[PDB]
């Protein structure tokens, strides 16, 4: 847990607010597998604004 469990086990922030571990992306967002790690089971879906 880069930043503690809320949503989910593995969903959390990461990339410093910039990314959230998401099981699917939205569209205003993009998945970042950097953070794809630190996520675990999940995928970094950061904001395509981050």
């Known amino acids: 847990s880069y930043q503690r469990i809320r949503s989910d086990h593995?969903?959390?922030?990461?990339?410093?607010?910039?990314?959230?571990?998401?099981?699917?992306c939205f569209s205003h967002e993009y998945?970042?597998?950097?953070?794809?790690?630190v996520c675990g089971s999940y995928r970094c879906c950061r904001p395509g604004r981050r």
């Open 31 to 37: 998945t970042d597998w950097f953070n794809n790690d």
């Open 10 to 24: 593995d969903s959390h922030s990461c990339a410093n607010n910039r990314g959230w571990c998401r099981p699917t």
